[PDB]
Structure 1
Amino acid sequence: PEEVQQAQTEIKLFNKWSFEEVEVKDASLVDYVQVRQPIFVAHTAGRYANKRFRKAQCPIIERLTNSLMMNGRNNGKKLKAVRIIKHTLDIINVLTDQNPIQVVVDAITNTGPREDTTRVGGGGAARRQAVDVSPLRRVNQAIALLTIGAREAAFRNIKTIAETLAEELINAAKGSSTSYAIKKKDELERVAKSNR
């Protein structure tokens, strides 16, 4: 068909958003976020969970696609997550028509809590010790916080999951702390610097 000829030259993301010209804003995420893979759909179910750093081999978009089916009511549903991801990407490209990939990457870069904190047992005296956060660890924490805020949005609201996800992604791209993930990153930095 016509879109078959269109995608025959440029392998866009589902032939609706270009899978090129994606940029990572924040530093310390190069080789921690997979954005160099030209693919068609985020369901490449090859064996990547076996190793530690092979989890960075899957795309962060495919990581969020796995994060959609993270609930008792939906653990193991694939095409529901894929269609919801396509709807959320269309909602992002409607709210911000630059690129769903670029806007999502900007939100991921702006939703990162740069510091961490640990509770040390101390032999019976727990204390708050500020510690660093690893690159893939920070990326996974941001993705998890975003998916959790999106899931917590659709508790008493007729809004679609794609709609709440796009609203949280817009709040994270703005960094306005109007989403749970951005509020969580701000509170995490505040707590880490509270006991630095």
Structure 2
Amino acid sequence: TPVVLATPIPEEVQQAQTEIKLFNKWSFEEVEVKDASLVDYVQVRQPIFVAHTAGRYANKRFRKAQCPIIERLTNSLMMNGRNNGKKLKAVRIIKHTLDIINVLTDQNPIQVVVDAITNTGPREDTTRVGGGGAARRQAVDVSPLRRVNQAIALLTIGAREAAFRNIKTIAETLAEELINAAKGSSTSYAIKKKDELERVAKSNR
């Protein structure tokens, strides 16, 4: 039975006393994505509450792998300058977007994020190689960590460009971007760009 205190503490919050859920709603106990090359670089094994941690992840090379992927998605929305900082908006925008996803699909909203990321990381990329000034591209592979880093970039960049001069609010454009990407649908801006990079990478082998 819920504890009674001099200062009342609602029962809905007291339910979390036996398990931690993000934003008090979404759970972490069933989220796993099959791409075996990224299980060590998507952090969904430590539940958190508010997607606002203030962690010190910049001091060492690979520490950013242990940051929960929900906050690393949150962190990428504070861009295009005017919105640098202003992290609270990011915590709220992720809240609306997740609620929307579970309305539109009836699947765990976090699972959508992990699926979309694992379907967007480009496997093959290219670099400039030459000598004296003449430059031609070369085919190379792409590391696990970088597939996540570039995956999130494409997702938030696509959502942000849509929200510009468009009636749909930011929370939605990211919601439809995430739904499509996990669906492996060419309508998504993220998947369009994954295929374009891979196609150029194959022509330059």
- Range class of TM-score, shorter chain: over 0.9
1:123-180 residue CA offsets vs partner (Å, 9 max, x unmatched): 3221111111111111000000001000110112110111000100011011112122
| Alignment match, 1:123 | 132
Pairwise CA RMSD: 1.1
Aligned residue runs from structure 1 range 35-50, under 5 A = 35-50=44-59
Match of 2:120 among 74, 97, 111: 111
The CA deviation at 1:88 is: 0.5
**SS of structure 2 residue aligned to 1:8:** helix
Percent of aligned positions that are identical? 100
**2:181 and 2:188 in contact (8 A); partners too:** yes
The CA deviation at 1:5 is: 2.3
1:11-47 residue CA offsets vs partner (Å, 9 max, x unmatched): 1111111122111232211211111111112111121
**SS of structure 1 residue aligned to 2:139:** strand
**SS of structure 2 residue aligned to 1:121:** strand
- 1 CA distance for matches of 2:195 and 2:36? 18
Task: Flag the structure with larger Rg.
Answer: 2
Match of 1:90 among 99, 102, 105: 99
More deviation, 81-90/116-125:
116-125
| Alignment match, 2:188 | 179
| Alignment size in residue pairs | 196
Bigger relative contact order, structure 1 or 2 (CA pairs below 8 A, ≥6 apart):
1
The CA deviation at 1:76 is: 0.4
TM-score (ref. length: structure 2): 0.92
The CA deviation at 1:92 is: 0.9
Task: Show structure 2 runs of 5+ residues with no match.
Answer: 1-9
Match of 2:202 among 176, 181, 193: 193
Aligned residue runs from structure 1 range 4-153, under 5 A = 4-153=13-162
